[PDB]
């Protein structure tokens, strides 16, 4: 039976900021915070993922206030807190969910210092998380249809011949952001069949801006169920869309590193 | 044993992918997927009539060579060429007896005094993986060298170099969607190119990459695994998210 480790790691999230306890105060009830990722050893930003499905900082539990949308998460003593509120299951989709209440950890504001609330699972960039020490986004060259490269310009995205900008920073919150302006997001406005995906701002952190690279080679919008698609397998159209997964080459991609 | 065909004669990018997709399709039933990553079948409990699959390779010259892949790790254990079979030196003895189930109809089985590991094949071929060019051409010329070694035409260094090509172009491309993509762009432009430090490090990390992902917490590694950019660079991985579009197959190491 597989070994059960308990790694200590930073939980990077919305807009590349990490999971932090406010001000480093560990008294029971203090707010858990969205904060720039540090390069230090202070336990305020390092979290141990224990076997009992609990995220702990300096020995204390990341605890949601209640079991309803809007309540914030506080640091609290693990034994004194309620068992059901101290528990979290981190899914391979980037969300961090609580088994009871069906509420995922959301960051309703990309500003530094946002108290982490817990909201309804709409698979938003606000509620996409990644436990890593790499506190800098992974920047790659995304290659897809016919070997072309995903390129962006001032709000327009398509594929073109791979010229060595075509660079994209894969943020921990599940967003894909053009390198030159990393405040902009790979956004889609609707859960419809041919909504052109382009570059907007990362403010709303909605779904349509959150993407997971599935093992089958696609780039899926988790809330949509449709994948990134070059329209009619035609790069010259300069058009990319969300389309139901069929598996053809015009929706298969690869993050070159 | 299941047989899967490929030919460098008229090989297109799609003719390469469905091949690797068919190889993956028979290397594992896809039943055990852990953290979006599929697992090869467990050596313990696997029937020997399900222990191997065979890939048949042909080329512009219509020379045929059939490789044998160990289902538990997708690595090449041997190959039949016409009337003769050839096997790498087995590591243990349980693997030495399963070899006897492979090419039974042929006359003269052969087992080399060397195993099929990169560092020894690199030693035998006198060249490193970082220098041996990969692509359709190299695979074509390698198919010939495996066929003619039986007739004394192929020498041992060219034999070992052919092994490094096939293993990388088949086994590794099955394990990694990334390395398959590296062979993908080579067919696309008709290139003869040695692999990056990116491909080399992935090949050298596969066993460790499987352990850490399976032995991971529900997502996170207990320890990092350092890798490479296409340009030789520093970067380490701490979670399985970045690896999902990269690793296609994992060796079994433990139970969920």
């Amino acid at each position, epitope marked *: 039976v597989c070994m059960d480790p308990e790694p200590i790691v930073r939980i990077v999230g919305r807009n590349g900021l990490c999971v932090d306890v406010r001000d480093g105060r560990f008294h029971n009830g203090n707010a858990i915070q969205l904060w720039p990722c540090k390069s230090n050893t202070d336990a305020n930003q390092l979290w141990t993922l224990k076997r009992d499905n609990t995220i702990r900082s300096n020995g204390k539990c990341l605890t949601t206030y209640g079991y309803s949308p809007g309540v914030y998460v506080m640091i609290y003593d693990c034994n004194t807190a309620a068992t059901d509120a101290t528990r979290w299951q981190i899914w391979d989709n980037g969300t961090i969910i609580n088994p009871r209440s069906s509420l995922v950890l959301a960051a309703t504001s990309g500003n530094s210092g946002t108290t982490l609330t817990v909201q309804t699972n709409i698979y938003a960039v606000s509620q996409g998380w990644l436990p890593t020490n790499n506190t800098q986004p992974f920047v790659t060259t995304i290659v897809g249809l*016919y070997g072309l490269c995903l390129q962006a310009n001032s709000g327009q995205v398509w594929i073109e011949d791979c010229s060595s900008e075509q660079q994209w920073a894969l943020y921990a919150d599940g967003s894909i952001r053009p390198q030159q302006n990393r405040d902009n997001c790979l956004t889609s406005d609707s859960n419809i069949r041919e909504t052109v995906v382009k570059i907007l701002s990362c403010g709303p952190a909605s779904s349509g801006q959150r993407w997971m690279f599935k093992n089958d080679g696609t780039i899926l919008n988790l809330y949509s169920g449709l994948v990134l698609d070059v329209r*009619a*397998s*035609d*790069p010259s*159209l300069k058009q990319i869309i969300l389309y139901p997964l069929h598996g053809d*080459p*015009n929706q298969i991609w690869l993050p070159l590193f | 044993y299941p047989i899967i065909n490929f030919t460098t004669a008229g090989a*297109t990018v799609q003719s390469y992918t469905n091949f690797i997709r068919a190889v993956r399709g028979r290397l594992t039933t896809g039943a055990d997927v852990r953290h979006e990553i599929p697992v090869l079948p467990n050596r313990v409990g696997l029937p020997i009539n399900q222990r191997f699959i065979l890939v048949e390779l042909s080329n512009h010259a219509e020379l045929s060579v059939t490789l044998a892949l160990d289902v538990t790790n997708a690595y090449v254990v041997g190959y039949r060429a016409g009337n003769s079979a050839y096997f790498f030196h087995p590591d243990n003895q349980e693997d030495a007896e399963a070899i006897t189930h492979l090419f039974t109809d042929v006359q003269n089985r052969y087992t080399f005094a060397f195993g099929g590991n990169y560092d020894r094949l690199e030693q035998l071929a006198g060249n490193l993986r970082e220098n041996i060019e990969l692509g359709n051409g190299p695979l074509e010329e390698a198919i010939s060298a495996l066929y003619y070694y039986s007739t004394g035409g192929t020498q041992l260094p060219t034999l070992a170099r052919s092994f490094i090509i096939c293993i990388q172009m088949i086994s590794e491309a099955a394990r990694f969607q990334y390395i398959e993509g590296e062979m993908r762009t080579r067919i*696309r432009y008709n290139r003869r190119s040695a692999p990056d430090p990116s491909v080399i490090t992935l090949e050298n990390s596969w066993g460790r990459l499987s352990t850490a992902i399976q032995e991971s917490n529900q997502g996170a590694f207990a320890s990092p695994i350092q890798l490479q950019r296409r340009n030789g660079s520093k970067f380490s991985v701490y979670d399985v998210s970045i690896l999902i579009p990269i690793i296609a197959l994992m060796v079994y190491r433990c139970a969920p």
Partner: nanobody
Amino acid sequence: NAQVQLVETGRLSCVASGTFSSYAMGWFRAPKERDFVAISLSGATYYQDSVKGRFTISRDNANTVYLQMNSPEDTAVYYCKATGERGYQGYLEVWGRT
């Protein structure tokens, strides 16, 4: 050095000189820029926003791909377009001759 000849007729009909490989199919429409109309490899489908439901594009690799027009501003010259990977380019694109 040779290419496919997409000869168009027509229910618009279009044939190639290999569609098995040739990726997708594309119909393009007035004496205005050459806008888009409408299949993937399998293939599936991609229609322009003006002509959803009215138009249907079909495929059968085993060398033809159609386009059925059902139900004035759509009057123009329509061309069938092909895509795929290359051996000559950077990728393959073929326009036809209706």
